[PDB]
mmCIF file of C-alpha atoms and ligand atoms in Angstrom:
data_model
loop_
_atom_site.group_PDB
_atom_site.id
_atom_site.type_symbol
_atom_site.label_atom_id
_atom_site.label_comp_id
_atom_site.label_asym_id
_atom_site.label_seq_id
_atom_site.Cartn_x
_atom_site.Cartn_y
_atom_site.Cartn_z
ATOM 1 C CA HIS A 2 -10.894 -26.541 -1.824
ATOM 2 C CA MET A 3 -11.290 -30.215 -2.692
ATOM 3 C CA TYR A 4 -7.874 -31.212 -1.367
ATOM 4 C CA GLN A 5 -6.884 -31.467 2.277
ATOM 5 C CA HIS A 6 -4.082 -33.251 4.113
ATOM 6 C CA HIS A 7 -4.810 -36.771 5.309
ATOM 7 C CA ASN A 8 -2.963 -39.894 6.437
ATOM 8 C CA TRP A 9 -2.896 -43.041 4.333
ATOM 9 C CA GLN A 10 -6.203 -44.311 5.802
ATOM 10 C CA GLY A 11 -7.863 -41.100 4.587
ATOM 11 C CA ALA A 12 -8.437 -39.371 7.922
ATOM 12 C CA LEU A 13 -7.714 -35.613 7.963
ATOM 13 C CA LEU A 14 -4.573 -34.194 9.559
ATOM 14 C CA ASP A 15 -4.427 -30.997 11.604
ATOM 15 C CA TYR A 16 -2.309 -29.054 9.123
ATOM 16 C CA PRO A 17 -3.376 -26.281 6.736
ATOM 17 C CA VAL A 18 -2.875 -26.440 3.010
ATOM 18 C CA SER A 19 -0.751 -23.736 1.444
ATOM 19 C CA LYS A 20 2.225 -24.209 -0.842
ATOM 20 C CA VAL A 21 4.440 -26.915 -2.271
ATOM 21 C CA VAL A 22 8.148 -26.202 -2.701
ATOM 22 C CA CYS A 23 9.851 -28.278 -5.369
ATOM 23 C CA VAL A 24 13.350 -29.148 -6.495
ATOM 24 C CA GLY A 25 14.328 -29.050 -10.160
ATOM 25 C CA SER A 26 16.450 -32.091 -11.020
ATOM 26 C CA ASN A 27 17.672 -34.081 -8.013
ATOM 27 C CA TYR A 28 18.419 -37.577 -9.268
ATOM 28 C CA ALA A 29 21.610 -38.897 -10.868
ATOM 29 C CA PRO A 40 26.887 -29.963 -6.708
ATOM 30 C CA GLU A 41 25.222 -26.858 -8.166
ATOM 31 C CA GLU A 42 22.671 -25.343 -5.790
ATOM 32 C CA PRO A 43 19.191 -26.942 -5.967
ATOM 33 C CA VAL A 44 16.825 -25.480 -8.583
ATOM 34 C CA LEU A 45 13.640 -24.288 -6.808
ATOM 35 C CA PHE A 46 10.069 -23.559 -7.921
ATOM 36 C CA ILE A 47 6.682 -23.520 -6.147
ATOM 37 C CA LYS A 48 3.251 -25.033 -6.792
ATOM 38 C CA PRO A 49 0.312 -23.057 -5.292
ATOM 39 C CA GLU A 50 -2.598 -24.349 -3.181
ATOM 40 C CA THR A 51 -4.632 -24.476 -6.342
ATOM 41 C CA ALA A 52 -2.376 -27.182 -7.800
ATOM 42 C CA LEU A 53 -2.922 -29.643 -4.941
ATOM 43 C CA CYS A 54 -5.393 -32.509 -5.385
ATOM 44 C CA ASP A 55 -6.367 -35.991 -4.237
ATOM 45 C CA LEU A 56 -4.223 -38.608 -6.044
ATOM 46 C CA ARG A 57 -6.887 -41.229 -5.362
ATOM 47 C CA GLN A 58 -9.519 -39.583 -7.541
ATOM 48 C CA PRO A 59 -9.510 -39.291 -11.343
ATOM 49 C CA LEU A 60 -6.816 -36.900 -12.572
ATOM 50 C CA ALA A 61 -7.662 -33.736 -14.478
ATOM 51 C CA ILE A 62 -5.150 -32.676 -17.126
ATOM 52 C CA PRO A 63 -5.182 -29.655 -19.490
ATOM 53 C CA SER A 64 -5.819 -30.566 -23.116
ATOM 54 C CA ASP A 65 -4.966 -27.379 -25.021
ATOM 55 C CA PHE A 66 -1.441 -26.665 -23.728
ATOM 56 C CA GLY A 67 0.634 -29.509 -25.118
ATOM 57 C CA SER A 68 1.812 -32.759 -23.553
ATOM 58 C CA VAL A 69 1.554 -33.306 -19.809
ATOM 59 C CA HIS A 70 4.336 -35.267 -18.096
ATOM 60 C CA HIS A 71 4.367 -37.276 -14.885
ATOM 61 C CA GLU A 72 7.085 -37.152 -12.243
ATOM 62 C CA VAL A 73 6.628 -39.500 -9.307
ATOM 63 C CA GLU A 74 8.287 -37.943 -6.267
ATOM 64 C CA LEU A 75 8.652 -38.375 -2.505
ATOM 65 C CA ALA A 76 6.499 -35.832 -0.637
ATOM 66 C CA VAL A 77 7.534 -34.526 2.757
ATOM 67 C CA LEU A 78 4.857 -32.854 4.896
ATOM 68 C CA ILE A 79 6.204 -30.047 7.123
ATOM 69 C CA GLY A 80 4.789 -30.020 10.662
ATOM 70 C CA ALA A 81 6.304 -26.827 12.060
ATOM 71 C CA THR A 82 7.703 -23.600 10.673
ATOM 72 C CA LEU A 83 11.234 -23.544 9.209
ATOM 73 C CA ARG A 84 13.053 -20.298 8.364
ATOM 74 C CA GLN A 85 16.796 -20.320 7.594
ATOM 75 C CA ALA A 86 16.617 -23.581 9.565
ATOM 76 C CA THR A 87 19.327 -25.983 10.691
ATOM 77 C CA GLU A 88 19.118 -29.676 9.853
ATOM 78 C CA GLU A 89 18.251 -30.454 13.470
ATOM 79 C CA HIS A 90 15.189 -28.244 13.034
ATOM 80 C CA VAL A 91 14.245 -29.815 9.706
ATOM 81 C CA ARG A 92 14.530 -33.294 11.227
ATOM 82 C CA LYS A 93 12.303 -32.455 14.196
ATOM 83 C CA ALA A 94 9.773 -30.700 11.964
ATOM 84 C CA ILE A 95 8.948 -33.081 9.114
ATOM 85 C CA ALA A 96 5.493 -34.542 9.858
ATOM 86 C CA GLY A 97 5.183 -37.365 7.346
ATOM 87 C CA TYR A 98 5.839 -38.856 3.916
ATOM 88 C CA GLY A 99 3.661 -39.671 0.892
ATOM 89 C CA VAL A 100 3.843 -39.643 -2.930
ATOM 90 C CA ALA A 101 3.115 -37.044 -5.548
ATOM 91 C CA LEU A 102 3.176 -36.385 -9.243
ATOM 92 C CA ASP A 103 4.997 -33.222 -10.179
ATOM 93 C CA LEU A 104 2.704 -32.847 -13.153
ATOM 94 C CA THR A 105 4.310 -30.557 -15.712
ATOM 95 C CA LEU A 106 3.520 -29.016 -19.106
ATOM 96 C CA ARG A 107 6.787 -29.864 -20.950
ATOM 97 C CA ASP A 108 6.029 -28.092 -24.214
ATOM 98 C CA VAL A 109 5.241 -24.891 -22.298
ATOM 99 C CA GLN A 110 8.274 -25.284 -20.051
ATOM 100 C CA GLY A 111 10.610 -25.572 -23.020
ATOM 101 C CA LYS A 112 9.296 -22.273 -24.315
ATOM 102 C CA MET A 113 9.820 -20.836 -20.812
ATOM 103 C CA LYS A 114 13.426 -22.074 -20.412
ATOM 104 C CA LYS A 115 14.494 -20.893 -23.873
ATOM 105 C CA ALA A 116 12.929 -17.571 -22.857
ATOM 106 C CA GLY A 117 14.259 -17.459 -19.298
ATOM 107 C CA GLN A 118 10.694 -16.965 -18.106
ATOM 108 C CA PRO A 119 8.729 -17.918 -14.973
ATOM 109 C CA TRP A 120 7.773 -21.579 -14.774
ATOM 110 C CA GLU A 121 4.358 -21.197 -13.171
ATOM 111 C CA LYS A 122 2.579 -21.864 -16.472
ATOM 112 C CA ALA A 123 4.306 -25.206 -16.909
ATOM 113 C CA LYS A 124 4.641 -26.254 -13.264
ATOM 114 C CA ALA A 125 1.851 -24.534 -11.363
ATOM 115 C CA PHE A 126 -1.372 -24.965 -13.354
ATOM 116 C CA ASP A 127 -4.506 -26.271 -11.616
ATOM 117 C CA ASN A 128 -4.179 -29.717 -10.087
ATOM 118 C CA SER A 129 -0.572 -30.009 -11.205
ATOM 119 C CA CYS A 130 0.215 -31.836 -7.979
ATOM 120 C CA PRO A 131 -1.933 -34.913 -7.275
ATOM 121 C CA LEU A 132 -0.859 -36.129 -3.874
ATOM 122 C CA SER A 133 -1.332 -39.281 -1.806
ATOM 123 C CA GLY A 134 -2.140 -39.426 1.887
ATOM 124 C CA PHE A 135 0.735 -39.104 4.358
ATOM 125 C CA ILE A 136 2.421 -41.576 6.646
ATOM 126 C CA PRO A 137 3.358 -40.084 10.066
ATOM 127 C CA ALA A 138 7.082 -39.483 10.454
ATOM 128 C CA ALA A 139 7.384 -41.815 13.439
ATOM 129 C CA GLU A 140 5.189 -44.434 11.787
ATOM 130 C CA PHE A 141 7.051 -44.633 8.498
ATOM 131 C CA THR A 142 8.611 -48.078 8.387
ATOM 132 C CA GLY A 143 11.936 -47.768 6.619
ATOM 133 C CA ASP A 144 14.522 -45.178 5.660
ATOM 134 C CA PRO A 145 12.966 -42.245 3.809
ATOM 135 C CA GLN A 146 16.420 -41.559 2.393
ATOM 136 C CA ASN A 147 16.373 -45.091 1.022
ATOM 137 C CA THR A 148 12.793 -45.576 -0.132
ATOM 138 C CA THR A 149 11.459 -47.110 -3.356
ATOM 139 C CA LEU A 150 9.604 -44.915 -5.879
ATOM 140 C CA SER A 151 7.761 -46.281 -8.914
ATOM 141 C CA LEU A 152 5.146 -45.287 -11.473
ATOM 142 C CA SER A 153 3.459 -47.515 -13.997
ATOM 143 C CA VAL A 154 1.209 -46.392 -16.808
ATOM 144 C CA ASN A 155 -1.239 -48.970 -18.165
ATOM 145 C CA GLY A 156 0.653 -51.952 -16.737
ATOM 146 C CA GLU A 157 4.017 -50.648 -17.938
ATOM 147 C CA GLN A 158 6.431 -49.373 -15.288
ATOM 148 C CA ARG A 159 7.985 -46.116 -16.466
ATOM 149 C CA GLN A 160 9.713 -44.853 -13.365
ATOM 150 C CA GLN A 161 11.675 -46.880 -10.849
ATOM 151 C CA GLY A 162 14.349 -45.672 -8.456
ATOM 152 C CA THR A 163 15.245 -45.267 -4.781
ATOM 153 C CA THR A 164 15.559 -42.271 -2.484
ATOM 154 C CA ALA A 165 19.249 -43.051 -2.126
ATOM 155 C CA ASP A 166 19.790 -41.698 -5.671
ATOM 156 C CA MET A 167 18.893 -38.143 -4.621
ATOM 157 C CA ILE A 168 21.664 -35.591 -5.188
ATOM 158 C CA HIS A 169 20.633 -33.301 -2.308
ATOM 159 C CA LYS A 170 19.240 -35.463 0.493
ATOM 160 C CA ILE A 171 15.898 -34.725 2.157
ATOM 161 C CA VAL A 172 16.835 -32.797 5.299
ATOM 162 C CA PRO A 173 19.633 -30.849 3.555
ATOM 163 C CA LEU A 174 17.385 -29.813 0.664
ATOM 164 C CA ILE A 175 14.589 -28.692 3.004
ATOM 165 C CA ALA A 176 17.170 -26.830 5.068
ATOM 166 C CA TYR A 177 18.386 -25.163 1.844
ATOM 167 C CA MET A 178 14.816 -24.344 0.739
ATOM 168 C CA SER A 179 14.060 -22.531 3.987
ATOM 169 C CA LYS A 180 16.780 -20.075 2.993
ATOM 170 C CA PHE A 181 14.557 -18.416 0.380
ATOM 171 C CA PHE A 182 11.069 -19.304 1.561
ATOM 172 C CA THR A 183 9.896 -19.930 5.091
ATOM 173 C CA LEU A 184 8.088 -23.290 5.218
ATOM 174 C CA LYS A 185 5.085 -23.176 7.518
ATOM 175 C CA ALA A 186 3.422 -26.271 8.935
ATOM 176 C CA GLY A 187 0.990 -27.753 6.444
ATOM 177 C CA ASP A 188 3.314 -27.068 3.504
ATOM 178 C CA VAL A 189 4.535 -29.912 1.338
ATOM 179 C CA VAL A 190 7.960 -30.508 -0.209
ATOM 180 C CA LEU A 191 8.552 -32.470 -3.451
ATOM 181 C CA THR A 192 12.010 -34.008 -3.532
ATOM 182 C CA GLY A 193 12.624 -34.621 -7.238
ATOM 183 C CA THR A 194 11.916 -37.478 -9.607
ATOM 184 C CA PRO A 195 13.841 -40.506 -10.855
ATOM 185 C CA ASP A 196 14.644 -41.189 -14.511
ATOM 186 C CA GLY A 197 11.786 -42.160 -16.834
ATOM 187 C CA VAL A 198 9.582 -39.048 -16.889
ATOM 188 C CA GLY A 199 6.911 -39.510 -19.544
ATOM 189 C CA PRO A 200 3.720 -38.061 -21.090
ATOM 190 C CA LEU A 201 0.212 -38.662 -19.718
ATOM 191 C CA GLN A 202 -2.926 -39.011 -21.842
ATOM 192 C CA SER A 203 -6.664 -39.065 -21.191
ATOM 193 C CA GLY A 204 -7.755 -42.583 -20.384
ATOM 194 C CA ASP A 205 -4.414 -43.782 -19.043
ATOM 195 C CA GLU A 206 -4.494 -45.690 -15.770
ATOM 196 C CA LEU A 207 -1.450 -45.225 -13.549
ATOM 197 C CA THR A 208 -0.336 -46.747 -10.285
ATOM 198 C CA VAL A 209 2.179 -44.863 -8.099
ATOM 199 C CA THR A 210 4.254 -46.601 -5.429
ATOM 200 C CA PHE A 211 6.586 -45.776 -2.582
ATOM 201 C CA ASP A 212 8.044 -48.226 -0.049
ATOM 202 C CA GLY A 213 5.316 -50.816 0.285
ATOM 203 C CA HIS A 214 2.461 -48.451 -0.543
ATOM 204 C CA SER A 215 0.454 -48.195 -3.751
ATOM 205 C CA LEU A 216 -2.467 -46.290 -5.194
ATOM 206 C CA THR A 217 -3.984 -46.653 -8.613
ATOM 207 C CA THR A 218 -5.883 -43.863 -10.325
ATOM 208 C CA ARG A 219 -6.704 -42.816 -13.921
ATOM 209 C CA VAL A 220 -6.613 -39.706 -16.101
ATOM 210 C CA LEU A 221 -9.854 -38.113 -17.252
ATOM 211 C CA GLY A 222 -9.224 -35.902 -20.245
ATOM 212 C CA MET B 3 1.687 -11.736 10.231
ATOM 213 C CA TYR B 4 -0.278 -10.453 7.232
ATOM 214 C CA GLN B 5 -4.045 -10.450 6.848
ATOM 215 C CA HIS B 6 -6.242 -8.572 4.378
ATOM 216 C CA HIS B 7 -7.506 -5.166 5.491
ATOM 217 C CA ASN B 8 -9.148 -2.051 4.025
ATOM 218 C CA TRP B 9 -7.329 1.277 3.867
ATOM 219 C CA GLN B 10 -8.680 2.334 7.266
ATOM 220 C CA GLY B 11 -7.135 -0.868 8.598
ATOM 221 C CA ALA B 12 -10.219 -3.010 9.273
ATOM 222 C CA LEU B 13 -10.042 -6.759 8.534
ATOM 223 C CA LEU B 14 -11.610 -8.100 5.338
ATOM 224 C CA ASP B 15 -13.468 -11.411 5.283
ATOM 225 C CA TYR B 16 -11.161 -12.891 2.611
ATOM 226 C CA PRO B 17 -8.510 -15.604 3.164
ATOM 227 C CA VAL B 18 -4.927 -15.175 2.014
ATOM 228 C CA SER B 19 -3.271 -17.585 -0.392
ATOM 229 C CA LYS B 20 -1.339 -16.495 -3.473
ATOM 230 C CA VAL B 21 -0.366 -13.581 -5.671
ATOM 231 C CA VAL B 22 -0.340 -14.008 -9.443
ATOM 232 C CA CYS B 23 1.729 -11.266 -11.102
ATOM 233 C CA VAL B 24 2.740 -9.965 -14.521
ATOM 234 C CA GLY B 25 6.356 -9.601 -15.502
ATOM 235 C CA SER B 26 6.639 -6.576 -17.757
ATOM 236 C CA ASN B 27 3.461 -4.690 -18.617
ATOM 237 C CA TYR B 28 4.088 -0.977 -19.250
ATOM 238 C CA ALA B 29 4.958 1.439 -22.071
ATOM 239 C CA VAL B 39 -0.220 -8.373 -31.305
ATOM 240 C CA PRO B 40 1.671 -8.156 -27.994
ATOM 241 C CA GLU B 41 3.256 -11.340 -26.654
ATOM 242 C CA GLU B 42 0.998 -12.716 -23.927
ATOM 243 C CA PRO B 43 1.487 -11.869 -20.220
ATOM 244 C CA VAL B 44 4.505 -13.360 -18.443
ATOM 245 C CA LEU B 45 3.201 -15.042 -15.270
ATOM 246 C CA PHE B 46 4.794 -15.959 -11.934
ATOM 247 C CA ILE B 47 3.375 -16.355 -8.416
ATOM 248 C CA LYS B 48 4.340 -15.276 -4.895
ATOM 249 C CA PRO B 49 3.294 -17.552 -1.973
ATOM 250 C CA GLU B 50 1.456 -16.454 1.172
ATOM 251 C CA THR B 51 4.799 -16.086 2.960
ATOM 252 C CA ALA B 52 5.735 -13.173 0.682
ATOM 253 C CA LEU B 53 2.815 -11.106 1.907
ATOM 254 C CA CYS B 54 3.503 -8.422 4.497
ATOM 255 C CA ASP B 55 1.996 -5.175 5.758
ATOM 256 C CA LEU B 56 3.322 -2.205 3.783
ATOM 257 C CA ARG B 57 2.413 0.207 6.613
ATOM 258 C CA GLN B 58 5.134 -1.512 8.625
ATOM 259 C CA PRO B 59 8.890 -1.322 8.184
ATOM 260 C CA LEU B 60 9.990 -3.552 5.288
ATOM 261 C CA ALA B 61 12.503 -6.372 5.668
ATOM 262 C CA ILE B 62 14.735 -7.296 2.754
ATOM 263 C CA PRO B 63 17.458 -9.955 2.335
ATOM 264 C CA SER B 64 20.976 -8.555 2.556
ATOM 265 C CA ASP B 65 22.931 -11.631 1.462
ATOM 266 C CA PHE B 66 21.494 -12.148 -2.039
ATOM 267 C CA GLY B 67 22.566 -9.083 -4.002
ATOM 268 C CA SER B 68 20.568 -6.071 -5.126
ATOM 269 C CA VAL B 69 16.937 -5.701 -4.038
ATOM 270 C CA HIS B 70 14.640 -3.705 -6.305
ATOM 271 C CA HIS B 71 11.243 -2.062 -5.840
ATOM 272 C CA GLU B 72 8.334 -2.276 -8.272
ATOM 273 C CA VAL B 73 5.291 -0.204 -7.445
ATOM 274 C CA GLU B 74 2.118 -1.865 -8.639
ATOM 275 C CA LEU B 75 -1.681 -1.762 -8.455
ATOM 276 C CA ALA B 76 -2.969 -4.684 -6.430
ATOM 277 C CA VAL B 77 -6.382 -6.097 -7.203
ATOM 278 C CA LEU B 78 -8.123 -8.144 -4.523
ATOM 279 C CA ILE B 79 -10.152 -11.028 -5.979
ATOM 280 C CA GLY B 80 -13.431 -11.635 -4.179
ATOM 281 C CA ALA B 81 -14.682 -14.797 -5.899
ATOM 282 C CA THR B 82 -13.539 -17.873 -7.830
ATOM 283 C CA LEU B 83 -12.365 -17.174 -11.361
ATOM 284 C CA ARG B 84 -11.564 -20.116 -13.623
ATOM 285 C CA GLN B 85 -11.397 -19.977 -17.429
ATOM 286 C CA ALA B 86 -13.514 -16.924 -16.648
ATOM 287 C CA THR B 87 -14.963 -14.368 -19.051
ATOM 288 C CA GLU B 88 -14.319 -10.663 -18.675
ATOM 289 C CA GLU B 89 -17.749 -10.295 -17.080
ATOM 290 C CA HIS B 90 -16.923 -12.807 -14.326
ATOM 291 C CA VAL B 91 -13.756 -10.834 -13.704
ATOM 292 C CA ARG B 92 -15.489 -7.450 -13.311
ATOM 293 C CA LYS B 93 -18.163 -8.846 -10.999
ATOM 294 C CA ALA B 94 -15.376 -10.557 -9.052
ATOM 295 C CA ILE B 95 -12.734 -8.058 -8.078
ATOM 296 C CA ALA B 96 -13.386 -6.729 -4.573
ATOM 297 C CA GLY B 97 -10.898 -3.886 -4.212
ATOM 298 C CA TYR B 98 -7.632 -2.146 -5.087
ATOM 299 C CA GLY B 99 -4.429 -1.285 -3.289
ATOM 300 C CA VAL B 100 -0.739 -0.647 -3.924
ATOM 301 C CA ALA B 101 2.057 -3.152 -3.553
ATOM 302 C CA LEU B 102 5.799 -3.351 -3.881
ATOM 303 C CA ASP B 103 6.776 -6.281 -6.123
ATOM 304 C CA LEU B 104 10.114 -6.698 -4.378
ATOM 305 C CA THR B 105 12.612 -8.552 -6.473
ATOM 306 C CA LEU B 106 16.202 -9.714 -6.329
ATOM 307 C CA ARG B 107 17.549 -8.353 -9.630
ATOM 308 C CA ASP B 108 20.887 -10.119 -9.377
ATOM 309 C CA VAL B 109 19.202 -13.450 -8.687
ATOM 310 C CA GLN B 110 16.583 -12.780 -11.381
ATOM 311 C CA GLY B 111 19.197 -11.884 -13.967
ATOM 312 C CA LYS B 112 20.953 -15.123 -13.176
ATOM 313 C CA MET B 113 17.690 -17.126 -13.333
ATOM 314 C CA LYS B 114 16.833 -15.581 -16.715
ATOM 315 C CA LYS B 115 20.113 -16.456 -18.375
ATOM 316 C CA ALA B 116 20.024 -20.006 -17.005
ATOM 317 C CA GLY B 117 16.407 -20.727 -17.979
ATOM 318 C CA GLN B 118 15.457 -21.623 -14.402
ATOM 319 C CA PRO B 119 12.373 -20.751 -12.247
ATOM 320 C CA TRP B 120 12.052 -17.244 -10.764
ATOM 321 C CA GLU B 121 10.849 -18.236 -7.286
ATOM 322 C CA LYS B 122 14.228 -17.450 -5.691
ATOM 323 C CA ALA B 123 14.106 -13.917 -7.074
ATOM 324 C CA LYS B 124 10.399 -13.123 -6.710
ATOM 325 C CA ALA B 125 8.915 -15.421 -4.080
ATOM 326 C CA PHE B 126 11.280 -14.919 -1.145
ATOM 327 C CA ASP B 127 9.908 -13.905 2.256
ATOM 328 C CA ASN B 128 8.134 -10.566 2.489
ATOM 329 C CA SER B 129 8.844 -10.100 -1.199
ATOM 330 C CA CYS B 130 5.405 -8.522 -1.430
ATOM 331 C CA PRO B 131 4.583 -5.533 0.797
ATOM 332 C CA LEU B 132 0.874 -4.814 0.467
ATOM 333 C CA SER B 133 -1.309 -1.851 1.394
ATOM 334 C CA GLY B 134 -4.900 -2.014 2.619
ATOM 335 C CA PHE B 135 -7.572 -2.356 -0.094
ATOM 336 C CA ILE B 136 -10.254 0.104 -1.190
ATOM 337 C CA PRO B 137 -13.565 -1.713 -1.826
ATOM 338 C CA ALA B 138 -14.308 -1.742 -5.568
ATOM 339 C CA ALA B 139 -17.506 0.170 -4.849
ATOM 340 C CA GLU B 140 -15.820 2.889 -2.787
ATOM 341 C CA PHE B 141 -13.074 3.296 -5.367
ATOM 342 C CA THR B 142 -13.672 6.737 -6.813
ATOM 343 C CA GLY B 143 -11.628 6.824 -9.965
ATOM 344 C CA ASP B 144 -10.669 4.511 -12.769
ATOM 345 C CA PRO B 145 -8.593 1.446 -11.928
ATOM 346 C CA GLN B 146 -7.495 1.404 -15.586
ATOM 347 C CA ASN B 147 -6.445 5.052 -15.394
ATOM 348 C CA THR B 148 -4.891 5.514 -11.943
ATOM 349 C CA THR B 149 -1.626 7.123 -10.832
ATOM 350 C CA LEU B 150 1.291 5.238 -9.265
ATOM 351 C CA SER B 151 4.427 6.722 -7.802
ATOM 352 C CA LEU B 152 7.206 5.521 -5.563
ATOM 353 C CA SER B 153 9.634 7.829 -3.792
ATOM 354 C CA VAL B 154 12.821 6.729 -2.051
ATOM 355 C CA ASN B 155 14.385 9.253 0.326
ATOM 356 C CA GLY B 156 12.473 12.163 -1.155
ATOM 357 C CA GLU B 157 13.477 11.593 -4.776
ATOM 358 C CA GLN B 158 10.988 10.502 -7.429
ATOM 359 C CA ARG B 159 11.725 6.956 -8.630
ATOM 360 C CA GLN B 160 8.541 5.778 -10.372
ATOM 361 C CA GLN B 161 5.741 8.018 -11.628
ATOM 362 C CA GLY B 162 3.151 6.563 -13.972
ATOM 363 C CA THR B 163 -0.441 5.721 -14.848
ATOM 364 C CA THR B 164 -2.262 2.428 -15.299
ATOM 365 C CA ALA B 165 -3.431 3.767 -18.637
ATOM 366 C CA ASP B 166 -0.046 2.723 -20.057
ATOM 367 C CA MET B 167 -0.630 -0.731 -18.675
ATOM 368 C CA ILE B 168 -0.590 -2.998 -21.708
ATOM 369 C CA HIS B 169 -2.733 -5.962 -20.704
ATOM 370 C CA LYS B 170 -5.711 -4.217 -19.107
ATOM 371 C CA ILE B 171 -6.796 -5.272 -15.637
ATOM 372 C CA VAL B 172 -9.826 -7.247 -16.764
ATOM 373 C CA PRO B 173 -8.292 -9.144 -19.742
ATOM 374 C CA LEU B 174 -5.085 -9.938 -17.835
ATOM 375 C CA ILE B 175 -6.998 -11.503 -14.973
ATOM 376 C CA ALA B 176 -9.164 -13.328 -17.495
ATOM 377 C CA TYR B 177 -5.926 -14.613 -18.990
ATOM 378 C CA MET B 178 -4.443 -15.562 -15.620
ATOM 379 C CA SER B 179 -7.478 -17.673 -14.755
ATOM 380 C CA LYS B 180 -6.653 -19.749 -17.866
ATOM 381 C CA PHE B 181 -3.725 -21.367 -16.021
ATOM 382 C CA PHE B 182 -4.513 -21.109 -12.320
ATOM 383 C CA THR B 183 -7.949 -20.516 -10.912
ATOM 384 C CA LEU B 184 -8.044 -17.418 -8.747
ATOM 385 C CA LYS B 185 -9.788 -17.773 -5.394
ATOM 386 C CA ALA B 186 -11.397 -15.297 -3.012
ATOM 387 C CA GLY B 187 -8.571 -13.658 -1.107
ATOM 388 C CA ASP B 188 -6.058 -14.160 -3.910
ATOM 389 C CA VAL B 189 -4.263 -11.001 -5.045
ATOM 390 C CA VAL B 190 -2.921 -10.095 -8.492
ATOM 391 C CA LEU B 191 -0.314 -7.465 -9.298
ATOM 392 C CA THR B 192 -0.766 -5.699 -12.642
ATOM 393 C CA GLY B 193 2.690 -4.432 -13.510
ATOM 394 C CA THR B 194 5.043 -1.565 -12.829
ATOM 395 C CA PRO B 195 5.933 1.519 -14.888
ATOM 396 C CA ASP B 196 9.642 2.065 -15.533
ATOM 397 C CA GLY B 197 11.953 3.535 -12.920
ATOM 398 C CA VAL B 198 12.646 0.351 -10.996
ATOM 399 C CA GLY B 199 15.673 0.741 -8.737
ATOM 400 C CA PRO B 200 17.403 -0.526 -5.532
ATOM 401 C CA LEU B 201 16.348 -0.383 -1.868
ATOM 402 C CA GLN B 202 18.973 -0.628 0.881
ATOM 403 C CA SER B 203 18.592 -0.622 4.661
ATOM 404 C CA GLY B 204 17.611 2.768 5.985
ATOM 405 C CA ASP B 205 15.740 3.974 2.911
ATOM 406 C CA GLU B 206 12.642 6.095 3.602
ATOM 407 C CA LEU B 207 10.004 4.866 1.225
ATOM 408 C CA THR B 208 6.743 6.533 0.262
ATOM 409 C CA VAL B 209 4.479 4.829 -2.284
ATOM 410 C CA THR B 210 1.380 6.403 -3.855
ATOM 411 C CA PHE B 211 -1.671 5.114 -5.650
ATOM 412 C CA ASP B 212 -4.008 7.799 -6.998
ATOM 413 C CA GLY B 213 -5.191 10.100 -4.243
ATOM 414 C CA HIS B 214 -3.812 7.845 -1.496
ATOM 415 C CA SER B 215 -0.342 8.039 -0.009
ATOM 416 C CA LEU B 216 1.602 5.900 2.440
ATOM 417 C CA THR B 217 5.133 5.994 3.826
ATOM 418 C CA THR B 218 7.420 3.495 5.492
ATOM 419 C CA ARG B 219 11.069 2.392 5.562
ATOM 420 C CA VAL B 220 13.529 -0.506 5.164
ATOM 421 C CA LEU B 221 14.987 -2.036 8.343
HETATM 422 MG MG1 MG C 301 10.673 -31.786 -10.964
HETATM 423 MG MG1 MG C 302 6.036 -7.279 -11.699
#
């Protein structure tokens, strides 16, 4: 239980940890593709990153993370709005090789998208403390000095409150849950020893991969 | 909401978090197919079951639930044995129509297996008080008096200990986490009003669909 919710400063928030609901592709329609990362996959983005080594390449997906503050079931956008508790950044770490086998087989994705620590996550910035428009926020990821992902929240197909509203249709989001909103173009592979710095609207963190 | 309890109904000192399950597992075998149901899918099977009515067919899958009592990670089969804390029955509720779609489109299964209350669960029988063989236990599910599923965990391909050993290779299992083995054949629909009675070797339980 290493991971726990906290603001940017590092102080703990009064929200449990539980699940992370994620969107398939959401950057440039057909209903949003949905999958879920378990509590086990959550981890501090500020500490070294632990990646599997015997399952094939591991890709990085920088994404905007929305922290739910109250329960949403078959919710309306007004409810979503009032409920989101903050924003931060995450890496929708995924085992591409494994996923390909899964897709071709029409099989669950948990092996490729839900393995341990497959969701490093930054601290959160309180909803009414977030300077700027979440729907128009900058997302970037650089690996060893080279920027590999750059985009803005405005390029999302399904916006933030609509997507969350849609998600609640299949799974009730309780407070403490996190929502990954998709990744921009530029998804790449991660390797032991790489140093990577993630960034979203004026905020940055730099960590490294172990092996 | 749901909380872990023993058959009698008393509360167990284990948290609730996830449910790692096998896809198909009854009859050099391809390895176990693995998906997971979130805490919000867990519900009390002694109570009337709630199913979605705007997403197509809703099927039942009777299964043997194994309650993990300690952290398992890249664990051996000995860690597994000394780690399971009990057994119970569960209904691996699934949206066949949605699952069929998901399969043909190579997309995740969450929508068809992780929806709310998609996992009715019975109380657990402490591993010590379990008089019988987990690996050779009966499972039956009756809907409105007619026999739907009638099997034995002996036909379970990936045995309970190896499977869980396997599962811990991808996601560590924590105390309170539950894993569903698999279901014999006989899987069918459940509509509102059905009277459902599920059985797991020597223990019976009945309930219905709202
Ligand atoms: Mg993604
Ligand atoms: Mg199953």
